[PDB]
């Protein structure tokens, strides 16, 4: 019953570990699933990058998978507009 309820909330069929994680911490697991949908696997990031983000002109490498290494460089941070949004000029994989 709770696996079918969890499948609707997370959008895929959960494993036994995900079901048993949903029993103990239902709000924490669903907030983790929401953060997984927005930011992805942030566990692969280096700890200074995990806590402090990026410096200007800093070049980091994130290995998201075996044989796949994202090359991320922060070139410029834009000033906030009237809507309060900043535009960050990244250089992801050379582009």
């Amino acid at each position: 019953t709770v696996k079918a309820d969890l499948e609707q909330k997370i959008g895929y069929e959960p494993g036994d570990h995900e079901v048993i994680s949903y029993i103990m911490y239902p709000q924490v697991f669903l907030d983790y699933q929401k953060m997984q949908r927005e930011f992805g696997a942030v566990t692969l990031l280096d700890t200074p990058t995990f806590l402090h983000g990026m410096r200007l002109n800093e070049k980091i490498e994130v290995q998201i998978e075996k044989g796949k290494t994202l090359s991320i460089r922060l070139d410029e941070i834009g000033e906030p507009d009237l809507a309060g949004n900043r535009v960050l000029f990244f250089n992801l994989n050379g582009q």
């Binding site: 930011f39 942030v42 990031l45 990026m54 992801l92 994989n93 582009q95």
Partner: protein
């Protein structure tokens, strides 16, 4: 005599005509609305001018007087309307030919006999082309019920002007035709005023076949070949293939000869497309498109004939065989097969509503057997809800149809547009289907297949990582 040409269109087709004119040694003039100021076609021409100032940016491209004034001020000898907007507008053709400018299109007689389906069906039956049985001319609601009674069920409600989901409903049970008639008439008076409807005998699982027709002012009329556009969603084409690999060659030759005899009967000139509905070795005329189609590219690929260049030179009044260099009808080759997929901003996870926003990523493929006709899809382009959802149409061509299918699958997986949602997963699902690869896809193939709407989860990890890095 012709040295400068204006394009009364936008987006990908304007760039296509600009490339054809530059290959033909002609200067190019672009027009653009204020809301289309970042369109690629504005900067692809030698001259660009703002049109329709103060209007909504669909009426600016429909502003006949402003386009005429810009063409006169820029000294453009001719006007090419592309497809859509004023391409089939007869008033635009009258004003262009009256102002002294060459109109890249068929004659005005072709314009009004093919501007509505009733006169097109009349010309088809007096050309001895086998049409679809239905009501003759303007019938009312009682005539619709009369035809539904004697000829039986199911029937299809169709207005004379337009189509493509505008004034085209269905009727399979009683008391449906009344509200279908009301909806079709409301959609007709919304766009073109009071437009008559003709009720059609609906066909169970038809195949949609388009025949491309090239004719000059000397009377030489040739068909390049035919193309199959049966892969349709809500009666709107999504993937077009050429030639119809699911049909026998003699049947396709017979359909092409029927379209040739129809266009020869009406004395057709320039480029045009004859649409058919096909079921069990019996074809039925539907309408004639008096312009170039969006899917002329696959015909160009399988025939080797530049359709836009040919229609420019036909507007220059040249002979199809001596001057253009196009061979005889039997000597037109068949260079394998080709598939056209239109990548739009329609999000299939949200009912194919067109997405808007900024495009932050654009990567296009290439290599052997790939043709790209991009519209406005570059990185940094802000997609507006004003214009059509089309980003870039991509055509894959190969000697075998299976090689074309696998090249199209490679193209759709290689393609990357981030920032707006595209119909690329839906196209991937349609390409992967066994009916499409066999080539026996019908008009109801998409609606009868629920598996085309199941989309695998995509973990765009670069976007998520950049979002988290920006957040922190």
């Amino acid at each position: 005599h012709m040295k400068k040409l204006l394009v009364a269109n936008r987006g990908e087709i304007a760039v296509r005509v600009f490339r054809a004119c530059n290959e033909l040694g002609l200067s190019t003039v672009a027009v653009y609305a204020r809301e289309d100021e970042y369109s690629v076609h504005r900067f692809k021409a030698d001259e660009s001018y703002l049109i329709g100032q103060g209007k909504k940016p669909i009426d600016a491209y429909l502003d006949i007087d402003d386009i005429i004034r810009v063409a006169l001020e820029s000294g453009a000898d001719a006007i090419h309307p592309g497809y859509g907007l004023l391409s089939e507008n007869l008033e635009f053709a009258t004003k262009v030919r009256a102002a002294g400018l060459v109109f890249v299109g068929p004659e005005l007689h072709h314009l009004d006999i093919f501007g509505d389906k009733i006169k097109a069906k009349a010309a088809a039956d007096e050309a001895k082309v086998p049409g679809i049985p239905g009501t003759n001319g303007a019938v009312d609601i009682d005539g619709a019920l009369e035809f539904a009674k004697t000829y039986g069920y199911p029937v299809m409600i169709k207005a004379a002007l337009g189509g493509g989901g505008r004034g085209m409903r269905v009727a399979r049970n009683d008391a449906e035709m009344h509200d279908g008639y009301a909806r079709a008439k409301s959609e007709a008076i919304g766009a073109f005023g009071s437009g008559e409807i003709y009720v059609e005998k609906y066909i169970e699982n038809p195949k949609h076949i388009e025949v491309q027709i090239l004719g000059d002012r000397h009377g030489n009329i040739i068909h390049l070949h035919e193309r199959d556009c049966s892969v349709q969603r809500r009666n709107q084409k999504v993937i077009e293939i050429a030639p119809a690999v699911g049909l026998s060659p003699d049947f396709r030759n017979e359909i092409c000869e029927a379209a040739v005899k129809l266009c020869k009967n009406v004395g057709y000139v320039n480029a045009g497309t004859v649409e058919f509905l096909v079921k069990d070795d019996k074809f039925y005329f539907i309408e004639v498109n008096p312009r170039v189609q969006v899917e002329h590219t696959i015909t160009e690929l399988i025939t080797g004939v530049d359709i836009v260049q040919a229609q420019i030179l036909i507007a220059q009044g040249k002979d199809l065989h001596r001057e253009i260099g196009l061979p005889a009808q039997s000597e037109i080759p068949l260079l394998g097969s080709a598939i056209q997929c239109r990548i739009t901003t329609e999000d299939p996870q949200n009912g194919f509503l067109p997405d808007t926003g900024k495009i932050d990523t654009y990567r296009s493929p290439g290599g052997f057997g790939i043709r790209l006709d991009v519209g406005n899809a570059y990185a940094g382009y802000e997609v507006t809800p004003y214009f059509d959802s089309l980003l870039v149409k991509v055509c894959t061509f190969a000697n075998e149809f299976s090689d074309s299918v696998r090249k199209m699958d490679r193209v759709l997986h290689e393609f990357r547009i981030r920032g707006v949602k595209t119909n690329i997963p839906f196209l991937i699902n349609v390409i992967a289907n066994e009916n499409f690869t066999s080539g026996q896809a019908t008009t109801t193939f998409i609606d009868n297949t629920p598996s085309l709407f199941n989309f695998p989860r995509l973990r765009d990890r670069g976007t998520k990582t950049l979002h988290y890095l920006s957040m922190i």
